Design a protein around this ligand. Structure first.
Ligand SMILES: O=C(c1cc(=O)[nH]c2ccccc12)N1CCN(c2ccccc2)CC1
Ligand SMILES: O=C(c1cc(=O)[nH]c2ccccc12)N1CCN(c2ccccc2)CC1
Lengths: 304, 304
């Protein structure tokens, strides 16, 4: 019992964090095999950050201008290439601590752990959701760039995110491990509009299921609804519309609790229309949307 | 920018998690050097859990009856002793992954990370506070016993907690690494009263300071208060009384923001008396008390 915002154990990922220095700028890198991945803005100066020509900038750079250090051992860089918004620095040594790994592009509404790093060292790990507008509500300071997001399936690490920037609005933007940004973001120190953000309805419902499993049942009511009626309420409250796929992904939680998904939707509809009324669900005075049905099932079943 | 419930990176602690089996019962253990620590209730059966004579129970047990496995290698047990509510099983092999470590007894109001484990494997890591009533609001299922709580100072792991039980009320109780329970709890399947719990006032104030640092300033007001007046309000709202020590621990955050601690107390007094009024502070619709002034400073300065 008990429901916490749980991150994945970060060990396999800590063994991949390195420090990448280029000129005066320093950020973090991911060392997997004989390649170190990092944001390409490591080759920038605080004059060209407004609009940098990364092609012309990387041309001024040689392998020896890229210092890669893992803990205390300096790594020898033998190659450099730009792939979208990331640099891949070939090192003459494979990482002995390289776990089984995949480079995946997650969807909005999906969750992952972030291992926040400064100078190649881990400072902390937290659980995040990729907001529908492709931003993350992280905790990142100067030097945090290159920090990665990931998930762990048994022994496999699925690298899904690499941190590149903080928007002036306080939210975080970054790329997948191929350098393609999530959202309309580009790597320039320019004001960038993060789209309108909605609430991940399927996650809010999964977290309602986690609350029923863990004893909080005040929100459960004598009503049911339809997908179309519930979506009228969801649209007014800036909530993502619920599809039949979402109802199918909620199947296991509905079976485990005996509460049909549309009955749960009706409880959420009254939580949206009437509020929490000063009450709490799983220690929270608001509707939590950063736990997918997979997270709720894994945490309420102890998958290692 | 951004403020998250951040746990410590769990790597050094994952390298210490083992599986301890004794009869039919299996739980987790902490392998540091040539000793594996685990809750003593591993020698119990579901008949004697009501009131077990652990001395008579451990007498029926031999070294070979204690199976210790780390990943896939079976460890050879050469000694067994009971220290309060934990067993120390001497193994003929030291843990190669033993980090620099201390066994510390934390105070209520202090925070730590929990690496939740099942069968010696890590499933997730989360940030906790030791409630003033010595319980923790964790997330633990069957097999989670032996999961440890810790903090990390550079490379040193301070083991502060070991999980033993869940109270019927949903909260978690356990011991320090010496087997002494935090609180009035004993290791029996009996209904145990967790004392009345209060809110950690000094942490709520530190989290108000974290909110000012990260841009949320709606709660700041044109008032100041006295320690004695603020404590009248704190007592009514089941909040821990604020001492001069708490005002001194809040010194650094007060200096970093230019808001005197008693001015911050006055804002908290109006948050307690008038509520949040449907607003949020750091994405939360309630007053967060699981971040100490040390956590807020470390997260708002990036200490690795
Ligand atoms: O170090 C940071 C950074 C990241 C963060 O998430 N939060 C911060 C908060 C305060 C101060 C800095 C940060 N950079 C690095 C320069 N930067 C940048 C430069 C060129 C092209 C694209 C981005 C913006 C992001
Ligand atoms: O495995 C658990 C357990 C721990 C937990 O935190 N949450 C649970 C939720 C559901 C089912 C079990 C648990 N035990 C192990 C037996 N147990 C026990 C037995 C003898 C003496 C002291 C304690 C109580 C705690």
């Amino acid at each position: 019992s008990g429901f916490r915002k749980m991150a994945f154990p970060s060990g396999k990922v800590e063994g991949c964090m390195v420090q990448v220095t280029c000129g005066t700028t320093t950020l973090n890198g991911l060392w997997l095999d004989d390649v170190v991945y990092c944001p390409r803005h490591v080759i920038c100066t605080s004059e060209d950050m407004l609009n940098p020509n990364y092609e012309d900038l990387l041309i001024r750079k040689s392998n020896h201008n890229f210092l890669v250090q893992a803990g205390n051992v300096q790594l020898r860089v033998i190659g450099h290439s730009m792939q979208n918004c990331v640099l891949k620095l070939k090192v003459d040594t494979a990482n002995p601590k390289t776990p089984k790994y995949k480079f995946v592009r997650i969807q909005p509404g999906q969750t992952f752990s972030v291992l926040a790093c400064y100078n190649g060292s881990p400072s902390g790990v937290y659980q995040c959701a990729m907001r529908p507008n492709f931003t993350i509500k992280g905790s990142f300071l100067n030097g945090s760039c290159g920090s990665v997001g990931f998930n762990i399936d048994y022994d496999c690490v699925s690298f899904c995110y690499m941190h590149h920037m903080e928007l002036p609005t306080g939210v975080h933007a970054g790329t997948d491990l191929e350098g393609n940004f999530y959202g309309p973001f580009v790597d320039r120190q320019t004001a960038q509009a993060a789209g309108t953000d909605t609430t991940i309805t399927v996650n809010v419902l999964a977290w309602l299921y986690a609350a029923v499993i863990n004893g909080d049942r005040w929100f459960l009511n004598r009503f049911t609804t339809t997908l179309n009626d519930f979506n009228l309420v969801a649209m007014k409250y800036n909530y993502e519309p619920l599809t039949q796929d979402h109802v199918d992904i909620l199947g296991p939680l509905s079976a485990q609790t005996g509460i049909a998904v549309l009955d749960m939707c009706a409880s959420l509809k009254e939580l949206l229309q009437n509020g929490m009324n000063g009450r709490t669900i799983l220690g929270s005075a608001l509707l939590e949307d950063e736990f997918t049905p997979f997270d709720v099932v894994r945490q309420c079943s102890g998958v290692t």
